[PDB]
Enzyme design. Structure first.
Site, PDB file in Angstrom:
ATOM      1  N   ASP A 292       0.924  -1.309  -0.203  1.00  0.00           N
ATOM      2  CA  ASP A 292      -0.033  -0.190  -0.016  1.00  0.00           C
ATOM      3  C   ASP A 292       0.927   1.001  -0.101  1.00  0.00           C
ATOM      4  OD1 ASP A 292      -2.272   1.867   0.816  1.00  0.00           O
ATOM      5  OD2 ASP A 292      -3.252   0.008   0.869  1.00  0.00           O
ATOM      6  N   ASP A 293       0.435   2.032   0.651  1.00  0.00           N
ATOM      7  CA  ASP A 293       1.353   3.558   0.506  1.00  0.00           C
ATOM      8  C   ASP A 293       2.202   3.584   1.810  1.00  0.00           C
ATOM      9  OD1 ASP A 293      -0.561   4.120   2.704  1.00  0.00           O
ATOM     10  OD2 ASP A 293      -1.879   5.555   1.805  1.00  0.00           O
TER      11      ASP A 293
ATOM     12  N   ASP B  30      10.469  -0.163   1.151  1.00  0.00           N
ATOM     13  CA  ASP B  30       9.850   0.895   0.544  1.00  0.00           C
ATOM     14  C   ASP B  30      10.548   0.882  -1.056  1.00  0.00           C
ATOM     15  OD1 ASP B  30       9.605   3.452  -0.639  1.00  0.00           O
ATOM     16  OD2 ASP B  30      10.216   4.389   1.291  1.00  0.00           O
TER      17      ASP B  30
ATOM     18  N   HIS C 295      -3.442   5.328   4.482  1.00  0.00           N
ATOM     19  CA  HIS C 295      -4.190   4.040   3.813  1.00  0.00           C
ATOM     20  C   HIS C 295      -3.616   2.737   4.255  1.00  0.00           C
ATOM     21  CE1 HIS C 295      -6.113   1.511   0.722  1.00  0.00           C
ATOM     22  NE2 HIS C 295      -7.158   2.149   0.889  1.00  0.00           N
TER      23      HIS C 295
ATOM     24  N   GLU D 178       4.970  -2.955  -9.032  1.00  0.00           N
ATOM     25  CA  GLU D 178       4.165  -3.814  -8.418  1.00  0.00           C
ATOM     26  C   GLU D 178       4.596  -5.358  -8.317  1.00  0.00           C
ATOM     27  OE1 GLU D 178       0.676  -4.290 -10.881  1.00  0.00           O
ATOM     28  OE2 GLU D 178       0.257  -2.062 -11.104  1.00  0.00           O
TER      29      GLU D 178
ATOM     30  N   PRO E 165      -6.521  -0.953 -10.392  1.00  0.00           N
ATOM     31  CA  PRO E 165      -6.988  -0.417 -11.634  1.00  0.00           C
ATOM     32  C   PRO E 165      -8.103   0.737 -11.035  1.00  0.00           C
ATOM     33  CG  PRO E 165      -7.013  -2.571 -12.283  1.00  0.00           C
ATOM     34  CD  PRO E 165      -6.740  -2.556 -10.780  1.00  0.00           C
TER      35      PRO E 165
ATOM     36  N   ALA F 242      -8.763  -6.727  -2.525  1.00  0.00           N
ATOM     37  CA  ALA F 242      -9.879  -6.137  -2.487  1.00  0.00           C
ATOM     38  C   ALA F 242     -10.774  -5.947  -3.659  1.00  0.00           C
ATOM     39  CB  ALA F 242      -9.754  -4.501  -1.794  1.00  0.00           C
TER      40      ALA F 242
ATOM     41  N   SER G  24     -11.501  -1.162   0.844  1.00  0.00           N
ATOM     42  CA  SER G  24      -9.991  -1.269   1.461  1.00  0.00           C
ATOM     43  C   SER G  24      -9.977  -2.180   2.762  1.00  0.00           C
ATOM     44  CB  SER G  24      -9.721   0.239   1.695  1.00  0.00           C
ATOM     45  OG  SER G  24      -9.562   0.794   0.648  1.00  0.00           O
TER      46      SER G  24
HETATM   47 CA    CA Z   1     -13.103  -1.944 -10.454  1.00  0.00          CA
HETATM   48 CA    CA Z   2      11.497   4.973   2.936  1.00  0.00          CA
END
Ligand code: CA
Ligand code: CA
Ligand code: CA
Ligand code: CL
Ligand code: NA
Ligand code: NA
Ligand code: NA
EC number: 3.4.21.75
Lengths: 4, 473
Positions: B45-46, B66, B86, B128, B148, B184, B260
Site C-alpha cells: 500500500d502507501d 519501500d 491508507h 508491482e 485499477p 479487495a 479497502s
Molecule cells: Ca473495479
Molecule cells: Ca523509505
C-alpha cells in the site's frame, strides 16, 4: 493508474 | 478459559464478535488458541507507520520494504491531507496489538505485520512486481487494497512482471506451498463497475474479497462479478457502524471504510487459518474459504445454488468468512491434488455478435488425459472480440450443472471501441462441479442501439483435479  | 481483549475500542469492533451473529466469528478462533502467532502478513500500500503504538509490537522489518524510494523503511510520507494513511489503517485490521490499552485489536493480533510502500509514486509494472515478490519465503500472506481505476470503463490487469510475480509466488513462494494474495474487489459500485474487468481480482491467484454492510446489505461501493470468492464486513450507510483500526500519526480511527477494509480482515482470518495448519497450499486456502463461508442473512437478489448445492452470489461469492470454521476445518485438512489445466478452444469460425450470440459446446474436460478434470476449481472464458461500445455487452457462462455465471454485466460508462483481447473472464461459482458436458456462452447487446462486432476466439480454460469430492451440500 493504480488507486487506493 | 479464553479471555477476550480489554482494548478500549474492542467493544466497537462489532464485526469480530457478538451475540447478534452479524460477525466474522473471530472470537471462536481465538478461543481455539489461534491468534496469528508465527504468521507474517504484508500490506502492499502507501506505507506503514511502524512505530504506531498499536503496531510496533507486531512490526516485522522482514515483511517490509519501500519500493517507491528504494529503501528498507516503509514509513509513510506525511502531508497535511494525510493521503498516506491508507496502509496503516489496513495494517491495524490485520494485526493491531491486543490488551495494550490502545485502540482495538487486529484479527490476528499476535501475527507479524509489515508494509510495502509502493503506491506513493508512479506505480509501474516493475513496482508491482517487486512488491508482490518481496521476501516470498518469509512473508506468508500479501494484502492489497488497491487496483485499477474504478471508473467503470477500464479493463486492466497485471502486466508481465506482475503476472510473473504471481506465478513465482504461488509456485515457489512459502517453501513451494505458494504465496497467499488477498485482494479487495473494488470501490466502483456507483459507476456500475465489474470486478471481472480488473485482472488482479479476476486472477485465480488472488482471493478477491467483497464487502457487506452491518445490516447485511450490498454497500453502495460494491462491485459485482463472478471472480469474487467471499466477503467480509465493511462500511455502509451512516446508521451502520464502520471499521476500527490504527490511523496515521499514532491515532485510532473508528471510520475506516469501503473495499479497502474487507481485504485486510480476510488476510487476518487467513493468518489464523495458516496458524492452524502451516502446510496449507495456496489452493487449499481457497478450498477452505469456499467450504466454510456463510451466505446466511446477506441480502442479494442474485443468490443461486450451484451444482454441488452451495449458495453463491456475484456480490458476495460464497458469503461471509467464518474464522472459527476456517481454523477448525484447516486442522485435519488433506492437501489437494496437484492442479490440472484443461484447455478447450471452442470456436471453429468467428461469430458475429449482433443483438445476441449464444455459443454451445459439449466438452469432455480432457477425458483420458493426465489433465482430466472431474472436480473444477476456477474456470475462465478467455474471449477475444471486437465491439463498437463495450459497456453495452452482457456476457454469461452456463456450466453443465446449470450454474449461470455473469462474466460481464452492462457498464454504462464503458464507451470503449477496443473490445476484449484474450481477456480471461473468471468464475468461482462452479467450484467442485464436474465440468464435463455442455457449456453455454451468451453475449448480448443490453441496449437498443444497433451495435456490431465479432467474437473471434473463445478458450474455455478449466482448472481443478480428478479426486476427493464431498457429498454435495
Ligand atoms: Ca473495479
Ligand atoms: Ca523509505
Ligand atoms: Ca490494541
Ligand atoms: Cl496456468
Ligand atoms: Na509449488
Ligand atoms: Na482472484
Ligand atoms: Na456433465
Amino acid at each position: 493508474x493504480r488507486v487506493x | 478459559v479464553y479471555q477476550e481483549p480489554t482494548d478500549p475500542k474492542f467493544p466497537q469492533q462489532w464485526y469480530l464478535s457478538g451475540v447478534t451473529q452479524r460477525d466474522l466469528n473471530v472470537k471462536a478462533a481465538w478461543a481455539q488458541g489461534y491468534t496469528g502467532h508465527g504468521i507474517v502478513v504484508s500490506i502492499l500500500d502507501d506505507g506503514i507507520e511502524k512505530n504506531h503504538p498499536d503496531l510496533a509490537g507486531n512490526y516485522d522489518p522482514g515483511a517490509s520494504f519501500d519500493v517507491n524510494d528504494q529503501d528498507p523503511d516503509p514509513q509513510p510520507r506525511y502531508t497535511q491531507m494525510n493521503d498516506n494513511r491508507h496502509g496503516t489503517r489496513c495494517a491495524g485490521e490485520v494485526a493491531a496489538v491486543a490488551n495494550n490499552g490502545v485502540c482495538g485489536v487486529g484479527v490476528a493480533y499476535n501475527a507479524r505485520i509489515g508494509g510495502v510502500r509502493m503506491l506513493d509514486g508512479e506505480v509501474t509494472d516493475a513496482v508491482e512486481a517487486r512488491s508482490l515478490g518481496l521476501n516470498p519465503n518469509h512473508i506468508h500472506i500479501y494484502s492489497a487494497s488497491w487496483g485499477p481505476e474504478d471508473d467503470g470503463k477500464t479493463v486492466d490487469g497485471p502486466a508481465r512482471l506482475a503476472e510473473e510475480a504471481f506465478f513465482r509466488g504461488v509456485s515457489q513462494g512459502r517453501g513451494g506451498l505458494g504465496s497467499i494474495f488477498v485482494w479487495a474487489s473494488g470501490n466502483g459500485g456507483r459507476e456500475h463497475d465489474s470486478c471481472n474487468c480488473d485482472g488482479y481480482t479476476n486472477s485465480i491467484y488472488t482471493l478477491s474479497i467483497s464487502s457487506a454492510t452491518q445490516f447485511g446489505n450490498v454497500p453502495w461501493y460494491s462491485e459485482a462479478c463472478s471472480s469474487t470468492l467471499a466477503t467480509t464486513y465493511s462500511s455502509g450507510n451512516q446508521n451502520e457502524k464502520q471499521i476500527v483500526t490504527t490511523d496515521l500519526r499514532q491515532k485510532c480511527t473508528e471510520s475506516h471504510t469501503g473495499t479497502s477494509a474487507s481485504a485486510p480482515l480476510a488476510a487476518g482470518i487467513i493468518a489464523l487459518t495458516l496458524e492452524a495448519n502451516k502446510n496449507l497450499t495456496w489452493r487449499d486456502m481457497q478450498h477452505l474459504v469456499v467450504q466454510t463461508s456463510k451466505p446466511a442473512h446477506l441480502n442479494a437478489n442474485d443468490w443461486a445454488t450451484n451444482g454441488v448445492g452451495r449458495k453463491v452470489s456475484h456480490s458476495y461469492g460464497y458469503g461471509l468468512l467464518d474464522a472459527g470454521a476456517m481454523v477448525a476445518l484447516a486442522q485435519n485438512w488433506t492437501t489437494v491434488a496437484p492442479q490440472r489445466k484443461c484447455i478447450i478452444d471452442i470456436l471453429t469460425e468467428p461469430k458475429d455478435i449482433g443483438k445476441r450470440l449464444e455459443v454451445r459446446k459439449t466438452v469432455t474436460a480432457c477425458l483420458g488425459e493426465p489433465n482430466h478434470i472431474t472436480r473444477l476449481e476456477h474456470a475462465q472464458a478467455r474471449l477475444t472480440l471486437s465491439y463498437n461500445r463495450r459497456g453495452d455487452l452482457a456476457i454469461h457462462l452456463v456450466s453443465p450443472m446449470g450454474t449461470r455465471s455473469t462474466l460481464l454485466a452492462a457498464r454504462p460508462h464503458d464507451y470503449s471501441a477496443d473490445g476484449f483481447n484474450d481477456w480471461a473472464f473468471m468464475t468461482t461459482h462452479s467450484w467442485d462441479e464436474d465440468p464435463s458436458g455442455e457449456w453455454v456462452l451468451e453475449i448480448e447487446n443490453t441496449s437498443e442501439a444497433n451495435n456490431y462486432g465479432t467474437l473471434t476466439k473463445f478458450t474455455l480454460v478449466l482448472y481443478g483435479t480428478a479426486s476427493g469430492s464431498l457429498v454435495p451440500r
